[PDB]
Design a protein around this ligand. Sequence first.
Ligand SMILES: Cc1cc2nc3c(=O)[nH]c(=O)nc-3n(C[C@H](O)[C@H](O)[C@H](O)COP(=O)(O)OP(=O)(O)OC[C@H]3O[C@@H](n4cnc5c(N)ncnc54)[C@H](O)[C@@H]3O)c2cc1C
Ligand SMILES: Cc1cc2nc3c(=O)[nH]c(=O)nc-3n(C[C@H](O)[C@H](O)[C@H](O)COP(=O)(O)OP(=O)(O)OC[C@H]3O[C@@H](n4cnc5c(N)ncnc54)[C@H](O)[C@@H]3O)c2cc1C
Lengths: 490, 490
Amino acid sequence: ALTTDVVVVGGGPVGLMLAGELRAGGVGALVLEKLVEPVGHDRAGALHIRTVETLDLRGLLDRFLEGTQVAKGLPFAGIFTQGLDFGLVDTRHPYTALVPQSRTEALLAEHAREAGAEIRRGHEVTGLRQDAEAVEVTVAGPSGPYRVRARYAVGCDGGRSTVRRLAGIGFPGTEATVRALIGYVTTPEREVPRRWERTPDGILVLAFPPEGGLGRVVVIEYTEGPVTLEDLGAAVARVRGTPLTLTEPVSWLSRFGDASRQAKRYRSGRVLLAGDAAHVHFPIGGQGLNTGLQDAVNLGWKLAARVRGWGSEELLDTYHDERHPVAERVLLNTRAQLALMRPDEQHTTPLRGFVEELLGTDEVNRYFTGMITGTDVRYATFAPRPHPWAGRFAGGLVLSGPSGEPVPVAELLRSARPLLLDLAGRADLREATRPWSDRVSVVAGEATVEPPAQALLVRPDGYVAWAGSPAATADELRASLARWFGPPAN
Amino acid sequence: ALTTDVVVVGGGPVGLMLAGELRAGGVGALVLEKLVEPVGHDRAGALHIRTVETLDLRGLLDRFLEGTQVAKGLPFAGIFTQGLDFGLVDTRHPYTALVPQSRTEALLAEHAREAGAEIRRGHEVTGLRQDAEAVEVTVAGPSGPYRVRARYAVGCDGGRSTVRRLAGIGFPGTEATVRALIGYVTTPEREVPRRWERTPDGILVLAFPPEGGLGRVVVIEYTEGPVTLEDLGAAVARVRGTPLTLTEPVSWLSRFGDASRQAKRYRSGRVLLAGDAAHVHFPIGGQGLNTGLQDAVNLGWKLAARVRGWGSEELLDTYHDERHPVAERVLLNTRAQLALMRPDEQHTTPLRGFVEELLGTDEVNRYFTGMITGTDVRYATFAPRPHPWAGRFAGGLVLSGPSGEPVPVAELLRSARPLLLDLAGRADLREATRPWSDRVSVVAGEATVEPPAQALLVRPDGYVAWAGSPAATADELRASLARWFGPPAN
Ligand SMILES: Cc1cc2nc3c(=O)[nH]c(=O)nc-3n(C[C@H](O)[C@H](O)[C@H](O)COP(=O)(O)OP(=O)(O)OC[C@H]3O[C@@H](n4cnc5c(N)ncnc54)[C@H](O)[C@@H]3O)c2cc1C
Ligand SMILES: Cc1cc2nc3c(=O)[nH]c(=O)nc-3n(C[C@H](O)[C@H](O)[C@H](O)COP(=O)(O)OP(=O)(O)OC[C@H]3O[C@@H](n4cnc5c(N)ncnc54)[C@H](O)[C@@H]3O)c2cc1C
């Protein structure tokens, strides 16, 4: 309790995002990151719709878009002729932001710092002890071992999570059967076609400048450790069927696989997990970091609330309840996509043909678009029956002010407080909310939503806690307010 | 020309169906079947919606339904929880008729005979010669070799088609990588669960009486010739993971695979191909014989018409044009389903999960239902733009007579003549059709169809040749009649 409120283990993008969220929630956040210096990641990155919407409601979207290429559509499982159609989903931001992870990390690190989080680099957590009041973290640092005492510890320490094992949380799942290499390497060859291809021997992307030079190589072969330029070239030759001249300078080289695992519990007492610490899977569709950043924004406000007292144990438990199912579906969909890309002219090629056809129908395209981009995420939480809007994402709504001015809910959410939106003129609900005004802001505005709602009680993460029609009463809102956001003041 | 009008090579179900069709068309049909006696086939069979509708419009449905079990829905690629929904497609016969092929063969053989086709058993075609006027078939028969002269020869002689090779028609496609066994064998074991199952080692169906005895075994293993009871038992043990006691009496045992081939041309001069002679593929979904019987009904009326003179060369060419694309899609969908059933917990199991979900949506379920049952078949033929009803199946329409009595188009089609249906009161179209009355029947009736049509010119196979709205003229109908059904009489 005495060193800090929350110790965030791991200063990757997820840990950094969480620290920002905890600071926005008015609690102390100490990030302990093992590495002195950041390391290399894929130089191509993707933040999809719901992540973009999430950044917007935290006021980070602008800095993430500056200088950024965006994609207005996406392939699906190596199908490029019927791309995922952002027009078929409801958003104010129909695009994917192609931000390299290194840049996402740098931006979040600066934000955590400006928000007052303490970030210690070269500090490795080596031990973890928990009792009814606090967590103690043991740390190997540049000036020797020391202990940190906190109310909570969150493992944001990646796929090889120290926190997860120390807390005795299971990581059930499958081991890899697919072997991929990725690299940024040089070719002397000119006019190497820039494309993805699928042969009987694997999947290959080559993306080099037409004049030669440093380029992107991804190679995937069906049924961990150092990678050499020779390894990469041999793999490329196997898949492609023709050698490609690859030379120094070599900028980055890595291995990855399709091991698919998920933490059985996202919470064990005063220890929680987020990001790859909580789920790993093959990188297909660019979903891992998106899921993690959203884990962080789900958790941050709830954990700060718990520390401050008005967030209940029940509330904190909804982190696992809400977010475990999401990553579960991500694991499954990445595995499914690997089946859809399997090199095999006999059966899989014909299947891909029908899937491609189906992608040209609005209903199926909408399904896979919602899946990849996160627009289909909604929660079933604290059911009383619930209003249709309960659990839906409201972060992208825009209201009309009394003078006709646009009032984006994304902007209202930047202060990281829950909001009561009065869409219809419900002075009774506005008044009923007064005893919670130390926590919840009330904003009246004109808007029609579908399905209809006269009022929306919105969580700091942009999802709707409670909603009301003309039949809703102040008593019902009082009950929801108490359950979600604690007892009335005074 | 002098022995017979058409020589049908092969007296399997497709050859027998075709002979019936040729007789209905008023031409001679001689079926030459190599085998003296029929042989064994799968004891479980399936005739789907469009086949059922087709039998109806030839007046054979009743005899095919007598004593028959029907299925009101179907699994898809070993998915049983969201079956294909016959309610989502337009038909008067929402079911699959579970007729064993041996019974289909016997029924069609009796019908061909009663219709006046000549059927010779134990007569093997060994040679084929073709000129500008006729085909000569050389035959090894019970009283020695002889020759048959005909206007046309149709190879309905199965996957190993003699006619196809003799005519120099290619059979491009893939060789098998999947090995299946099927058998009717005895077990002494009691209460062997009746079910389909998919394990990491294959696909297996066991269907035995609870008290033991003769039962159905199908086993499929992923990457031709005699099969023993030992072979079957060893395969069952590999897939199931536990041996099953199998003993005599053994009633039937067979091998099959997923070789997928299709005749590059369905017609070469005076030689045509139908049925498995024209296309083979893995038996999944029960589509092979359905496709063949429909091949036969597409061809029969057109070929008889050609023999009689009013059917043009252009008309006969539409057999290939219309039917080749159909079997092409069947080959592809069977290959695709094998991908969907592939034993593989790593990737395919998760994919199957999403496919199962999608099958619970009307749009995707309708798609696969139409695919398997043939309700999605429609033709793009003799485009003039064409009326929306052109090429659609009208065989299941029912009209109201002048006295209110129901007048099924299926019954009207039994005489095997094209029909002009006057749905609105178009005396001008009725009159315009008189010079073709030796070939085409005119029937007035009340009915609203969707999309709207005032008149439908229906082919003997139940598909629409031409349709008209109020703007259609008698001149347009004259032109269509001439193109489809020959010059006006007199
Ligand atoms: C090739 C590739 C391409 C990808 N592309 C995309 C994409 O386009 N879009 C997308 O959303 N996702 C993508 N991903 C997935 C994404 O990179 C991960 O989901 C993301 O790195 C997870 O972030 P994290 O903060 O949870 O974990 P990490 O990035 O692994 O950070 C964990 C941090 O914890 C620190 N740590 C570990 N142990 C300790 C300890 N004991 N004490 C202190 N600190 C510790 C580590 O040093 C590390 O810095 C891709 C992944 C790969 C491999
Ligand atoms: C296990 C299994 C289950 C199946 N289940 C279904 C199902 O449920 N539904 C479905 O629609 N389909 C099913 N099928 C496919 C179906 O059996 C075939 O499509 C069907 O047999 C094709 O009929 P056919 O008349 O074209 O050829 P065949 O049945 O092979 O008949 C060809 C005939 O030609 C004769 N012949 C060959 N050469 C000569 C010659 N030179 N001279 C004279 N005669 C010759 C042969 O003796 C044979 O009798 C299944 C197939 C298998 C293997």
